[PDB]
Design a protein around this nucleic acid. Structure first.
Ligand SMILES: [Mg+2]
Ligand SMILES: [Mg+2]
Ligand SMILES: [Mg+2]
Ligand SMILES: [Mg+2]
Ligand SMILES: [Mg+2]
Ligand SMILES: [Mg+2]
Ligand SMILES: [Mg+2]
Ligand SMILES: [Mg+2]
Ligand SMILES: [Mg+2]
Ligand SMILES: [Mg+2]
Ligand SMILES: [Mg+2]
Ligand SMILES: [Mg+2]
Ligand SMILES: [Mg+2]
Ligand SMILES: [Mg+2]
Ligand SMILES: [Mg+2]
Ligand SMILES: [Mg+2]
Ligand SMILES: [Mg+2]
Ligand SMILES: [Mg+2]
Lengths: 76, 188, 57, 135
RNA sequence: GCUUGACGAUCAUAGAGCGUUGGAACCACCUGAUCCCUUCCCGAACUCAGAAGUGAAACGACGCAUCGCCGAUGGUAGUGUGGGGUCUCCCCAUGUGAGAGUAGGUCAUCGUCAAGC
RNA sequence: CUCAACGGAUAAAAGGUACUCCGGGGAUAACAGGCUGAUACCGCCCAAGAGUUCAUAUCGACGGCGGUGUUUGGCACCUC
RNA sequence: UCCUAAAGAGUAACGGAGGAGUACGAAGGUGCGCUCAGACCGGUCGGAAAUCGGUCGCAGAGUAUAAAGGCAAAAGCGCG
RNA sequence: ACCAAACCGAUGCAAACUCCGAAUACCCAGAAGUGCCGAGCAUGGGAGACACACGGCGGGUGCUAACGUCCGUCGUGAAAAGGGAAACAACCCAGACCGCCAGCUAAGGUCCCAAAGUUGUGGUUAAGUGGUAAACGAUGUGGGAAGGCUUAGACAGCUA
């Protein structure tokens, strides 16, 4: 009947773009259910949050069947 | 049916709008089977005589690019929607042997006296026009004559009723459909 | 070679971005002519601020 | 009048009315048409004032198509009401016209009986509408 | 490169449909279920013991653009900065430039060994 | 600890003033002005029709474009 | 949770629409298996519809709970 | 003789609909030049502010009404004088250290108030348009490209 009541905007998005250099446990993408899949050396935590495990450069490559988006980190 | 052209070595948006107000020209292209596409300027006055002609759409037109001559058939008319006038033309080279689909007008030649008109309630409603073609360019169908002087009331006309004379096919019969053409019904 | 430029408009109603393209060339005020080393990245600043300038060669 | 049967929502934004009309500017069914050369918006009672003008200057036959359909609800606040206590109720329905759009089509009549019939329907519409033929 | 298997590379120009075709090597159906083992019932599936038969089915190759899928050139829509006008909308200079549609394409291309030439 | 006035004044809290009072404010209302014209008012375009025939002697349904600031408003720029 | 929100984050209105103040000792872990809805044909008391068999499917089903974003190593279903 | 799923063909439209899809804006790296001699970051001392205003471009609301009102982003006022718009915080031009009876320019201008062309060239417009306004009406006029008939006699008028 009356309607205000929004929420407080959880600050999602994609950090660490296509040519960065990452540390051991950085946050790559704050996902909301797998826009991006776990590529070569990344983690996929509890609420589908991609994080690194090794060092290098982010790739953002599209692979395979289903055309899914794979975030791999390359030792380069 | 004859028209002469030029070369148009200036592309883009800005150079393509100065043509239409300074010199009154219309852009075009000539793309075909064995050659490259070639852009072209034409005048708005000379296309106006051809577009006013009846069967000029389903007909071979010669083109003088420079002194270059080519038998050219027209399949597009981009047209200005607001005021109403011609924009760029986009026609086609004609090879002496190629399959060459195009579009053909209709006429409905004999409907002054029909069985549904003079006996029953008289209405004839033309649904379709501009039926396509798929024919070698050695024989050009300028038009197709359809006769509805004998079809009674309550009957419709499919595409199988009218015919395509002397080596002409119909693409809609090459698919699994047969579109209705004309109806005869009762007025209200 | 080089090319000389001439600041022919004022800087006091402009953006925060054209006002730094002109300062990157080295122009301080109106009717002030400098020489630039005509690299591909020094003539990229000229293409932004083309209307404040008189590129008289 | 002409309005949807049921709607997924109830009220809608205003928006704008930009651009020309590239799809909608070609005559498809009839052989004469009344296309619109000025932008505006039609309020679904003007359509019935213009339909009932064409359907009594013929009285013999022909066939009429109505190419445009209003689906955009508009609001109106009541009187002696200050501003800001919500949003007003839906009073009527609006189609949005932009230059080139074809409004009515006719066929099965003469070339000049129809020409003086769209003169009647143009005097009920708030737009500058022209006369066009099938090619 | 040709033959069949295994594992990949690349994800439709590699798909679907139709047609055609293969053995005694491979593979598949097949024969039994006593002996492992299995079925909310059932040797269907799972598994074991095998070589009576077959290439039907399946599976590979080989053809067809009929559906699908890719897709030019030109024009057009929109838009950054600077100016305009009759200023709820557009226009000029300049940089940028789709989507849709058209001409046409497509019955994929490779790599690693093991058994065949 | 429905401390839900959800960063939570205290273990523990309802109302009247036309008998009124002090400090302020045109950061804010009622009167008149200002900008606006939905409404109001005088008009004008198509003309189904009735005026026994005959749309325009007089009216004119369905709808459309303007003018004046005259009353019902909208806003809160001036003056507490 | 969505829209306004201008293709990074953020962002107002007494702006348009909806939900929560919980369940669960398996509705958790693991190993092993397995696919939907719907249409249609045939089949006794059911019949537009129950259970069974069949082809067609190509996720249009499902997700303890709103909507959004997801799901074939199925994040969906069964067993130890 | 009404009606009507579903399917085929043509045909339109959504802020809470997407098979698609830019310009810009954002990030990170590698370089040349310029920075008024610094631009950045960190630690300390001292504050003021937390009533905003208009204009341009995207929007909500409103009647796509208000110098209305709530946002996004640049600009000006606030805290900026000078020249222009007759006078006109917020629009165009340009940012005042002081002195000069010195010169060249910007927007705006050049008959007289009023500083500078009664300048040159090619046409238009007779209404004081210029120097306020809509549907709509009309042998106003200038230009353009096509037509319709015509010395076999057209169009007008005068006679049957
Ligand atoms: Mg300043
Ligand atoms: Mg394209
Ligand atoms: Mg008393
Ligand atoms: Mg007092
Ligand atoms: Mg006040
Ligand atoms: Mg005040
Ligand atoms: Mg965003
Ligand atoms: Mg943005
Ligand atoms: Mg679960
Ligand atoms: Mg599994
Ligand atoms: Mg959208
Ligand atoms: Mg405060
Ligand atoms: Mg405040
Ligand atoms: Mg204000
Ligand atoms: Mg205010
Ligand atoms: Mg100074
Ligand atoms: Mg001088
Ligand atoms: Mg003087």
């Amino acid at each position: 009947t009356r309607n205000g009541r929004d929420s407080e905007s959880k600050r999602l998005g994609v950090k660490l773009f296509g040519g960065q250099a990452v540390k051991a446990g950085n946050i790559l993408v704050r996902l909301r259910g797998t826009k991006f899949h776990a590529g070569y050396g990344v983690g996929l935590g509890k609420d589908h949050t991609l994080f690194a495990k090794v060092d290098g450069v982010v790739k953002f490559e599209t692979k395979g069947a289903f055309g899914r988006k794979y975030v791999s980190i390359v030792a380069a | 049916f004859i028209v002469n052209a030029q070369v148009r070595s200036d592309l883009g948006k800005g150079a393509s709008r100065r043509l239409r107000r300074n010199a009154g020209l219309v852009p075009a292209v000539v793309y075909g089977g064995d050659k490259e596409p070639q852009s072209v300027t034409l005048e708005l006055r000379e296309i106006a005589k051809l577009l006013e002609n009846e069967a000029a759409f389903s007909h071979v037109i010669a083109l003088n690019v420079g002194g270059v001559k080519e038998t050219v058939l027209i399949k597009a008319l981009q047209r200005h929607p607001a005021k109403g006038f011609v924009m760029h033309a986009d026609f086609l080279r004609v090879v002496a042997d190629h399959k060459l689909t195009a579009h053909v007008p209709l006429h409905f030649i004999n409907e002054e006296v029909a069985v549904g008109v003079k006996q029953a309630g008289g209405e004839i409603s033309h649904t379709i026009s501009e039926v396509e073609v798929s024919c070698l360019p050695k024989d050009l169908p300028e038009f197709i004559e359809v006769d509805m002087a004998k079809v009674e009331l309550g009957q419709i006309v499919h595409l199988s009723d009218l015919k395509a004379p002397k080596g002409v096919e119909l693409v809609q019969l090459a698919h699994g459909n047969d579109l209705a053409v004309a109806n005869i019904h009762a007025s209200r | 070679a080089t090319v000389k430029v001439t600041l022919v408009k004022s800087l006091n109603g402009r953006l925060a971005n054209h006002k730094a393209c002109v300062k990157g060339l080295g122009l301080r005020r109106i009717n002030h002519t400098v020489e630039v080393q005509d690299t591909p990245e020094n003539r990229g600043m000229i293409n932004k601020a083309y209307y404040l300038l008189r590129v008289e060669g | 009048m002409l309005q949807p049967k049921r709607t997924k929502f109830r009220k809608q934004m205003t928006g704008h009315n930009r651009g020309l009309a590239h799809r909608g500017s070609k005559v498809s069914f009839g052989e004469y048409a009344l296309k619109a050369t000025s932008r505006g918006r039609l309020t679904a009672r003007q359509i019935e004032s213009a339909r009932r003008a064409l359907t009594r200057h013929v009285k013999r036959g022909g066939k009429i198509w109505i190419r445009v359909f209003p689906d955009k609800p508009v609001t109106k606040k009541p009187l002696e009401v200050r501003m800001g206590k919500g949003k007003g109720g839906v009073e009527y329905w609006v189609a949005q016209i932009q230059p080139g759009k074809v409004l009515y089509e006719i066929e099965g009549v003469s070339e000049e009986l129809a020409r003086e019939a769209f003169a009647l329907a143009a005097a009920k519409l708030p737009l500058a509408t022209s006369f066009v033929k099938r090619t």
